Amino acid sequence: KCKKTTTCEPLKYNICLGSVLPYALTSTVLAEDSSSQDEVHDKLSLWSGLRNAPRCWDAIRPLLCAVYMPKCEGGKVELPSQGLCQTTRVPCAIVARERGWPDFLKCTTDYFPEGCP
Numbered sequence: 001k002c003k004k005t006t007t008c009e010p011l012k013y014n015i016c017l018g019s020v021l022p023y024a025l026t027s028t029v030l031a032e033d034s035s036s037q038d039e040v041h042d043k044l045s046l047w048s049g050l051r052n053a054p055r056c057w058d059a060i061r062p063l064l065c066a067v068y069m070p071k072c073e074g075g076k077v078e079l080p081s082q083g084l085c086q087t088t089r090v091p092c093a094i095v096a097r098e099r100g101w102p103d104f105l106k107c108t109t110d111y112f113p114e115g116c117p
């Protein structure tokens with residue numbers, strides 16, 4: 001569905017690349033490059049190397065937050081939508097040409113299901 005069974009843990013940080021998150025629990029299961037919130041914070045630091053291109057940086061940040069620090073509640077996590085995923089393809093093409101999107105950040109419907117509420 002638009003949710004995935006997981007383990008909820010309390011957010012280590014209330015902040016995701018400049019934005020305050022209106023929830024308290026999260027999970028790392030969507031970010032398949034991170035096995036803890038420490039590594040999540042690490043990989044987000046690396047993602048911050050993109051803020052020299054405000055074009056992509058303004059687009060990719062909701063995506064990064066939705067994937068790396070998603071809202072968890074009752075053993076499930078909110079999955080990022082196809083709509084959100086698609087909006088980053090063009091303005092963040094620099095990511096694709098210089099190293100390439102990780103598989104969990106590519107716009108397949110398994111990671112980013114269409115028609116989410």
Ligand SMILES: CC1=C2C[C@H]3[C@@H](CC=C4C[C@@H](O)CC[C@@]43C)[C@@H]2CC[C@]12O[C@@H]1C[C@H](C)CN[C@H]1[C@H]2C
Pocket residue numbers: 033043046047048049050094095098099100101102
């Ligand atoms: C910021 C940046 C990126 C960090 C991203 C990478 C996509 C995938 C991952 C995997 C993820 O686990 C960690 C973050 C990482 C490495 C993306 C590629 C483009 C760029 O790398 C260039 C380096 C260059 C020196 C300057 N310009 C830099 C930027 C255009």
